[PDB]
Amino acid sequence: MHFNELRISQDNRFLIIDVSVDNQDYFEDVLLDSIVIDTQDTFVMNGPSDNPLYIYNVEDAYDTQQMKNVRLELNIQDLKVSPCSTMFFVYVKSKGTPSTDTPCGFDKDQILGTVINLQPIYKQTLKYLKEVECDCNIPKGFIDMILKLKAIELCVRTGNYPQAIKYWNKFFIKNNC
Amino acid sequence: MDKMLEISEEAITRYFTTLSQFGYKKYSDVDKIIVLFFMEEMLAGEMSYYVTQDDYRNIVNALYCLAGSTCMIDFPMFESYDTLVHSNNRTFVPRITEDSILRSTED
Amino acid sequence: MDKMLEISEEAITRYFTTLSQFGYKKYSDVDKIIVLFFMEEMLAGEMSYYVTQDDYRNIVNALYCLAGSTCMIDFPMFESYDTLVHSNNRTFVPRITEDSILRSTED
């Protein structure tokens, strides 16, 4: 499986999830099962935690190719979480069994997608650039913010989500958007 | 886990490789190793039935204080395909130059 | 006992081996040896009939102060198959997918 788009809407009111199953000839039997949303408070290593933020079952929406593609637009204010200072973790699962000719490693039933609001980072960069316009000196806080973002990106890409949570809570938690 | 085993084995092999090359390693790091494999045997034994998910969160977040603390212990790598900003591969396909009462339309 | 004999014999053989290699051994350890074989002859003689089990507890717990005190005396090893956390080898065998009024069942 894979994500088509996974972002918070530009108006900071919806959390957009658009999932699809991969198009190979050996995934015809594989469908989509459920979508589970977790935050930086409830996240756990081994799969979605108990008491998640938002559980979604795909059978309910549809009445077979329809179940291979799913799109959602979750009003974040209905989830009772802050769109500015929240790190959503989106798990997806597959109610299927791939063929026997599946190459080794491609039969991964679960995926994960981390979401943050990019608006506060954009505004912070604009503030730092405005400060740079005065006397053409780069603030050290600006380089710090850039490198801390790169650290969180590396933590996400290597799968080390808890240390990414520590960095996010410690460095980027207070955000205005 | 199957991974705390790997981390502990790698950590102690690095420990004894260091004790082979040099004749010394900081005991402040031997302490980290002791904590690490004590946790590994704690979680892979008869005492893993006392662990809630809150306890799991706390144990993991306490273990990642040991991650880059020394050269024996490294940051584990898991099989991940995510990132903070994702790519949008959706395609635009309008219908015969049509629009709804307020906005555009596609297939 | 049959073991205080062994401990005392080992202790004094180590004593005289040390006096053969070197020409000196701490008298603070000769004191421990004196106490040790005095207890051994005390408990293996005509004065063992005055010993209660409380006295036995006290004598043993006082003798194990001498255990790792010096190189002559070692911690004795006894034939033991126990540990602080035991292994559970029981097997689960349900009966035709049945359960009692509240819980599961086996053979």
Binding site: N46, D50 | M1, D2, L43, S48, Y49, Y50, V51, T52, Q53, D55, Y56 | T97, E98, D99, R103, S104
Partner: peptide, 19 residues
Amino acid sequence: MFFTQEDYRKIEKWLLANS
């Protein structure tokens, strides 16, 4: 893989639900 208490509770409850 690692199980917590809650995982065992779910498994046993679901076993008993269907027996």
